[PDB]
Write a protein that binds this DNA or RNA. Sequence first.
RNA 1: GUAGGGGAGCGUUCAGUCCGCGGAGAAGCCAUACCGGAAGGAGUGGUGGAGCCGACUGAAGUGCGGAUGCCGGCAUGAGUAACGAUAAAAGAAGUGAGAAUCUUCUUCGCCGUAAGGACAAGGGUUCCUGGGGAAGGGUCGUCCGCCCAGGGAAAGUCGG
RNA 2: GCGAGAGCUAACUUCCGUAGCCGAGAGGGAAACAACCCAGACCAUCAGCUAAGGUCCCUAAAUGAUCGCUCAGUGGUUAA
RNA 3: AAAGGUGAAAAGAACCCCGGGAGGGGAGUGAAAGAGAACCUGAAACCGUGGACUUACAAGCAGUCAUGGCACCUUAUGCG
Lengths: 130, 56, 117, 113
Amino acid sequence: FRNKKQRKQQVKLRKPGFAVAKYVRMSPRKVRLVVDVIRGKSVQDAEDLLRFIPRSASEPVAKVLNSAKANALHNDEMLEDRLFVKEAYVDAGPTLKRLIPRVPRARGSANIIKKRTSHITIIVAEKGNK
Amino acid sequence: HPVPKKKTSKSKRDMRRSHHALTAPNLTECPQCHGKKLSHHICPNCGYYDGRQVLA
Amino acid sequence: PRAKTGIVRRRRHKKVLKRAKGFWGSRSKQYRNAFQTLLNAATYEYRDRRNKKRDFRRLWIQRINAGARLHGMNYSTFINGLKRANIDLNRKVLADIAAREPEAFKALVDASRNARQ
Amino acid sequence: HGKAGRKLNRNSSARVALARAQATALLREGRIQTTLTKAKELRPFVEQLITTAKGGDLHSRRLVAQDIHDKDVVRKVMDEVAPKYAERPGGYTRILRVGTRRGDGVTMALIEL
RNA sequence: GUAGGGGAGCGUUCAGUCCGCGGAGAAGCCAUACCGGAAGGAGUGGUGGAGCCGACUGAAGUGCGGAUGCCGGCAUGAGUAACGAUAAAAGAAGUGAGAAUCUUCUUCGCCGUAAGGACAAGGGUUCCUGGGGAAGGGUCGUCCGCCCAGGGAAAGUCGG
RNA sequence: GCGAGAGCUAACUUCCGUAGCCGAGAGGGAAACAACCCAGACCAUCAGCUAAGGUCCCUAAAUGAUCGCUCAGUGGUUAA
RNA sequence: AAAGGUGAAAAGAACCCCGGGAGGGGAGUGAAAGAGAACCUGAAACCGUGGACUUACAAGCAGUCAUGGCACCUUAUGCG
Ligand SMILES: [Mg+2]
Ligand SMILES: [Mg+2]
Ligand SMILES: [Mg+2]
Ligand SMILES: [Mg+2]
Ligand SMILES: [Mg+2]
Ligand SMILES: [Mg+2]
Ligand SMILES: [Mg+2]
Ligand SMILES: [Mg+2]
Ligand SMILES: [Mg+2]
Ligand SMILES: [Mg+2]
Ligand SMILES: [Mg+2]
Ligand SMILES: [Mg+2]
Ligand SMILES: [Mg+2]
């Protein structure tokens, strides 16, 4: 152990099976719907479902799923035939603004806003339960 | 006129959203190009539906 | 020189907030509604604190005349005959003597009988 | 309780000029792909039209000449296409569903001769 | 025990002293079942990375739930209502990481005292070429009146 | 509540007297209920006695004892 | 009008992986990348993911008291 910064510098902090889509312009509430079916089953199925799921959010959710498998297979030296989504989840976003509607309490009322809210991330592990 | 009275709570609201749960496609692997296709349509991969159809 | 409100309000608030636990929804989370829940919470605290004693009174009695009746007397009759005997200043919590230890409570009954006729 | 034989999507004049145009094209190309329902509409309208064409008289041909406005298209259906189906009890058109679409999320399909 | 009066005090910024603590880590933030009659105050554990408790005295922009209070942020209404004229569109072909929407062909419907054409005022490179795909475009986007760069505008007689 | 006026010897009325409560009063009773009945809460107690009120079951406490009444659900709506 | 902060120092991330991209995962530099250019801390509202105990005859200012079940034992086996 030693102390705080000792631990800090003897250890570099890995992130196995992890990858994240930041800032995809889309509403996370939507994206959760796509994601919820993926979560828990084998990354193969995940690729299939995602190929065939009619939501447009399905698109960048698949794009990420592979990167996180791709990270798992290369950086973590894992086994793609043991691979499954350990976890996935979506939130956040610096919800977009140009602030072009300068608002004098009137005449445009309230409209717009375009959430950047995506932040899609997925995490892969090996089953090994068998 | 007719506006809502209070905000709705997180609890009752998600209770409303109880039903929006997505149905994931029930898939099947294609007998020909061995990739997963969708029932009563063409396998997007080979193009085969009973013998062969689209050119992909 | 000025003193900004910094970390003073926040502290107090955090304390109030922490007092709120299994509190349902808004109560347990945002300040004002928590605090003002805690006003009525005070009311019920102190008052029920004076109360639970009336409550347990009730319970114990409700047992005592139950056993008495199992033996053929009642709370009125039982404490009447018991206290009619300067013998028993016995009184408090005697319920569990009826509940746990039957033979004893029986003897106290018969005592209450000899102290009658 | 709305009950009838016909489906429309647009108005009364449209569904015509469209069913005419789609008939015209399927006979021109031999297979086209369009939204699934539009194909389901197209099927029996063009099929009956294959049958006006066979039987081969000038009358028949001038009946065809109403819906089919391209003289080349009609000559093809009449001389090439019609006769070719002969011992065919009627009804060559079949319908194959391809799959869903990107922009509008609509499932689409091929109707083929 | 309400206005109201009286008494003791808690906490916060600054200042002077006093004592000190801190890279083996300050304040701040996080949790917490301990202490105190209350305001409150410590114990340790997690964050942090350059400073800071305790004591005495003095000075205050010194204590917020309210004011349809102020700036900000984020909810509810909800994946609702809408997507800005009921002049319909259709197939093939092309390109591309991806096309209902961009390009081409062939048809279709619409204006045609216009919904065509030319000027004035006003706008200010919006024109053309080659790119580009963040935002802007009520969807999309390979596209654009958006973004980048380069080019383009010629007068003795027209208008001054 | 009492003692008067205005009023209709009406008003959860209005205006003076007069005690008490509310106001600024929590606790018990009156099903609920400012004022009414009992009683003015310094703090702790899984101890005891009582007040107004109650002691068939919702609820603690006699389904008490003795002499009547009332058969109407009077009780638990008023009069000539 | 609002609008400040990598790091001591640019050493500001060669190279590799998924992707058109955005974005991230490694490697490396660094005391630290628990500093990565949406670069000091990073509260709260607010949205999620996982877990523990729970909920589909119950009339609810969300609390309060009393007991039982269940789970957990760093101010912490007790008045928890
Ligand atoms: Mg019918
Ligand atoms: Mg019908
Ligand atoms: Mg017409
Ligand atoms: Mg919709
Ligand atoms: Mg609605
Ligand atoms: Mg509706
Ligand atoms: Mg429009
Ligand atoms: Mg049209
Ligand atoms: Mg016309
Ligand atoms: Mg767009
Ligand atoms: Mg009055
Ligand atoms: Mg009453
Ligand atoms: Mg314990």
